[PDB]
Amino acid sequence: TSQVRQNYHQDSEAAINRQINLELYASYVYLSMSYYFDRDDVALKNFAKYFLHQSHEEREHAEKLMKLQNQRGGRIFLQDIQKPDCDDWESGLNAMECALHLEKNVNQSLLELHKLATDKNDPHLCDFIETHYLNEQVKAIKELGDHVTNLRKMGLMVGGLAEYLFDKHTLG
Amino acid sequence: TSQVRQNYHQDSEAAINRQINLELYASYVYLSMSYYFDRDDVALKNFAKYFLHQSHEEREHAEKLMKLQNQRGGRIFLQDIQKPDCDDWESGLNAMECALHLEKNVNQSLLELHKLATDKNDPHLCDFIETHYLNEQVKAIKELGDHVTNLRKMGLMVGGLAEYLFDKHTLG
Amino acid sequence: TSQVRQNYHQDSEAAINRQINLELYASYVYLSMSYYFDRDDVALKNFAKYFLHQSHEEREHAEKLMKLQNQRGGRIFLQDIQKPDCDDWESGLNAMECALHLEKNVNQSLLELHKLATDKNDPHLCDFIETHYLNEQVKAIKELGDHVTNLRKMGLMVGGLAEYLFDKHTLG
Amino acid sequence: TSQVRQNYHQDSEAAINRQINLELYASYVYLSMSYYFDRDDVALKNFAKYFLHQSHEEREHAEKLMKLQNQRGGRIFLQDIQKPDCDDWESGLNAMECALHLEKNVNQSLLELHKLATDKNDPHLCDFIETHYLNEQVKAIKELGDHVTNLRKMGLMVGGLAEYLFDKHTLG
Amino acid sequence: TSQVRQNYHQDSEAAINRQINLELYASYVYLSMSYYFDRDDVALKNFAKYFLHQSHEEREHAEKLMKLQNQRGGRIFLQDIQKPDCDDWESGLNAMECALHLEKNVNQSLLELHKLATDKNDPHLCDFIETHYLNEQVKAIKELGDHVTNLRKMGLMVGGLAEYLFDKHTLG
Amino acid sequence: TSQVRQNYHQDSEAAINRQINLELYASYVYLSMSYYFDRDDVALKNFAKYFLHQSHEEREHAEKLMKLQNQRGGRIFLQDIQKPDCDDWESGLNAMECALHLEKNVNQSLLELHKLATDKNDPHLCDFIETHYLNEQVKAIKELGDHVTNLRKMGLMVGGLAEYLFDKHTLG
Structure with a gap:
């Protein structure tokens, strides 16, 4: 037992540990995407700038x-x-519709973190999760949803220019 | 009955009261539009910025x-x-034409407001309406008109890319 | 159903729409008061300024x-x-006692809304309500209580003079 | 006994301990008033500000x-x-007459202290109270004096209005 | 009755008055500690600065x-x-252990406060408690904790060199 | 195969990939250390400042x-x-003896990478490895060794204080 611990459950310590692992997996995922878009076979600099910043x-x-x-x-x-x-993340839209699948999954995992802390009655942990993670995670989920509909909407026919112009104008 | 009233017709009042309702109607619809393009399935952040500016x-x-x-x-x-x-304003051209249909409506009610004032023969109020509303509204209508024809010239095949580039370059 | 949606109940969806109508209603009410004090038969420019700021x-x-x-x-x-x-809002005391009565009612809307979200397990909507509205709303009822109480104590019937000075010194 | 103690009587040591309780008492009392005027049914922001600085x-x-x-x-x-x-301090006049009554009691206590030190042969302790406390305490008692007289003179049954204006112009 | 009161239980009102006493209690003990370290036989300047700041x-x-x-x-x-x-707080880490014992006491008093408010269903008072107090209190307890351990790992023989160096380098 | 590739062997393709995993491992190792030192059972602000910097x-x-x-x-x-x-990384000396052990291993894997590029006769990769890593590696092993001997030397007896002062004076 520690000298600082006060109303901090046995279950909720083990829980945020898992969450720590989660968002590290996710940054790992983000630089795997971001250095995919700097390949000489895709060459979308601002995409990479975007996924690296998300990773960081x-x-x-x-x-x-x-x-x-x-x-x-x-x-x-x-x-x-x-x-x-x-x-290999196929296209530039598959990458965005796959990132959306991921931070929707951490947000899921972030809500169970909350409702565990809501039930082991740790008000502090719950304030921490509301202020620092939950609206940031929804604001992000909103940003990736906009990107996919803007990409899909230029679908298709010219397409390869579609993602090119998208790279230069929406992430620049 | 009132200290200040002087040559203010009994029905130039009833008309100005009405004209007030109209301009509140237009601000409502603009907020309706502006948050429609703020949707994740429409996602044209500069269209939204545009109609919100008209709503104010x-x-x-x-x-x-x-x-x-x-x-x-x-x-x-x-x-x-x-x-x-x-x-549901479907698209970015529908929104602009259906907006243009509105500004022709406020202009036609503002022009009726002028004539009611030229026939209850109130020189002051008509200067007020021409100064603050009429050239403001024809400016408005010509600005609504250009946008409409430009989205049309980006017609037919493509289209969804059309709405996008217009968003980036004419509303940026 | 939308891409971004995750942990957003159809009951918290209808509820916020009812709540939007509320806040647009309330600002309309303050606007009605604000140009009421702009009348030449009441003439309190700073009462006018104050409710116009609340409307905005x-x-x-x-x-x-x-x-x-x-x-x-x-x-x-x-x-x-x-x-x-x-x-016709009758008095400047009557005006502020109807304002106080209004944001006490918008508050029960905000509180039922918060307890609507506390028992559909949406922590995010609660922080949004906690952070952006809830303390913002009791800072208003307190201010309105201050202003109601100052107008009542001095009034007696030293008469309208009470009101003029209040405009100049607490609302200037 | 300390290495530093030198011409410091055990009788004037216990007395300053008694004097510390007093000024901590007065600060608590001034703080108790200060938020009295922070109440919505009393609502004198600058009365609150004034006594808050006194407790400080x-x-x-x-x-x-x-x-x-x-x-x-x-x-x-x-x-x-x-x-x-x-x-509950009843009034703004009632407040300023218990405030005056207290600093007169703190003074009698400070003067009794100065004569304990002049008669237990402590030259230093007397300048300490002379320089840092005595004249500050008469400039308070005089100022507690004006305010009481100003509130009383205009309190002549215009009533609550007297108090508002004093808050604005003498305590602003 | 009171013209602002809206969703504020008399038991949650009885509780904050109770809680107000605690941090006046907490500030009083800090003033007792910091002026203990201002003594000529303890003479740790930055310790004295530290608890005086906490007392504030x-x-x-x-x-x-x-x-x-x-x-x-x-x-x-x-x-x-x-x-x-x-x-007589004896020592420099006796005083810190004894503080760490205190802020765990206020942090436990605020957690009971936060949950009596979760039971009388006061959404506003909880956001006040977590934003203004709880994270404040766990930041404090962790700061009391590091110091306690560092003064310990300098313990056993020598020591007092410990108190001195810690005064100079961690509290300067 | 790749449009850009020229004088780049499939053995050095696999080789750089392997090396990538390594330093993320070391990066993983370094945060793991740094948040060991931010514990209330270690409480060494600047060790963390230093190991977090290396992981970064x-x-x-x-x-x-x-x-x-x-x-x-x-x-x-x-x-x-x-x-x-x-x-749990034990002492602060064990931690740096263990970091020194870590970067001495990657250097050895880093020079093995270098001698694979001089034997698959690829000048650029060796320049890249010479300019960007190999001296950075020696400047690193030199600093960890400096820290180790300063820590050993100094805490030969009355320790913990040794490690305390070292945190404040060599990592400040």
Whole structure:
């Protein structure tokens, strides 16, 4: 037992650990995507700029959770990071409709973090999850949804220009 | 009965009261449109920025009329602000033409307002209407007209890309 | 059903739409008061200024709610905004006791809305309601209580003079 | 006994400990008034501001004594700080006459202190109270004097209106 | 009755008055500690600066609670400030352990406060408690914790060199 | 095969990929250490500041490697990151003896990478490895060794204080 721990459940410490692993997997996924778009066979610089920046703040999301662990007196237990499923993300829209599938999955996983803390009656943990993660995660989910409908809407016929112009104008 | 009233007809009042309702109607529909393009399945952030700007300045057209009514001694009697008969504005061209149909409607009611004032023979109010509304509205209509024909020239095949580029370059 | 939607109940969707009608209604009411004090037979420019400022950011409250909806994947369904129950607000004390009575009622809407979200397990809507409206709303009822109470204490019937000075010194 | 203690009587050591409780008492009482006018049924923002600054200063008189205690080698012995005899201060005039009554009681206590030190042969302790406390305390008591007289003179049955204006022009 | 009160239980009003006493209690013990370290036989300047600063922000925590009672229509009933049970805090880490023991006590008092408010279904008071107090209190407890361990890992033989160096490098 | 590729062997394609995994491992190892030192049972602000900085730049090092693969026409194949064997890094000296052990291993894998490029006769890859890594590696092993001998030397007896002062003076 720690010297700082106070109303911090046995279950909720083990829980945010998993969440730590989650958003690291996700930043890993993001740089796997971002260095795919800098390939000489896709060459969409601003896409890469976009997915790398998304990756860099999911590592920030991960670190901020790691502080909260230390702040509440719990103890961090690192776990391995699994490689993203895809190694080649096909198109530029598949990448965006696949990123949307991912942060919708962490948001899922973020809501169960909340309702666990809502039921082991940890008000602090719940304020932390509302302010720092939940509206950021919805605002993100909104940004990726806009991107896919804007891409799909230029579908198709010219298409390869569609994603080109999209890269230069919407991520530039 | 009033201290300030002087040559302010019993029905140039009833008309200005009505004209106020119209400009509140137009501001409502513009908010209806502006948050329609703010949808994740429509996702044209500059169309939204555009109609939201019209929603404000038609509203400040409306409160500029309320000012004037108090100024001549007639008294505002507000009415209900009916709902836009549309919920789904389908596309970006439909929105602009259906908007253009509206500004022709406020201009035709503003022109009737002028003549009612030329026939209850109030020199002052007609300068007020031509100064603040008429050239404002023909400016408006020509600006609505150009946009409409440009979206049309980007017609037929393609199209969804059309709406996009117009969003980036004519509303940026 | 929309791409972004995740943990957004059809009951919290209808509820915010009812709540948007509320805040547009309220701003309309403040607008009706604001040009009431612009009359030459009441003539309190700073009462006019004050309620006009209140009108301008229940509209900013209404948009913040409409945008919040697009963000969670719901769709907006606008309704008519009805006329305020009064055309003549009688006094400056009467005006502020009807304002206080109004934001006490918008509050029960905000509180039932918050308890509608607390028992459909949507933590995000609650923080949005907690952060952006709930304390914003009791800072208003408190201010309205202050102003109601100052007008009542001095009044007695030193007469209208009470009201003039209040305009100059607390509302200037 | 300290290495620093030198010509510091055990009788004037206990007396300054008694004097610390007093100024902490007065600060608590001034704080108790300060939020009295923060109530919505009293609503004098600047009465609240005024007494809030006064509590912020006798409590800063209090550490000036506790610092002085360690400087002369004595040892502080803290006691409880008592609930003010009054929870509802009735008036703005009533407030300013218990405020005057208290600083007169703090003074009698400061003057009794100065004669304990001039007669236990402490030249230093007397300048300390002369320089830092005595004339500040008469400039308070005189100013508690004006305000009471100003409130009384105009309180002549115009009533609550007298109080509002005093808040704005003498405490602004 | 009170003309702002809206969804504020008399039991949640009884509780904050209770809580107001605590942080006035907390500030009182900090003033007892910091002026203990201002003694010529303990003489740790930055320790004295530290608890004096804590004594302030708890007194600022406390008077912010009083503002919340008035905005909601519940009325402050001040109580006595009982004296800290310690007079000689012995040591530099005895004083810190004993503080860490205290802020866990206020943090437990605020968590009971937060959940009595979750039971009388007060959405507003909970956002006030988590945003203004809980994360404040866990930031504090973790800060009391690091210092406690660092003063310990400098323990055993030498020591006091410990207190001195820690005063100079971690609190300077 | 790739449009850009020229004098880039399939053995060095697999080789750089492997090396990528390594330094993300080291990057993983470094955060894991740094949030060990932010614990209330270690409480060394600046050790964390230092290990978090190193974890932040082995990932900079790793992304630099991934850009070069895209630069030369090979294709990145990411794999999983194994958790550091340690979860608790013991002392601050053990931690730096263990970091020194870590970068001395990647240097050895980094020079093995270099001698594969001089034997598959690829000048550019060796320049890339010479300029960007190999001296950065020695400047790194030199600094960790400096820290280790400063820590050993100094805490030969009365320790913990040793490690405390080292945190404040060499990592500030």
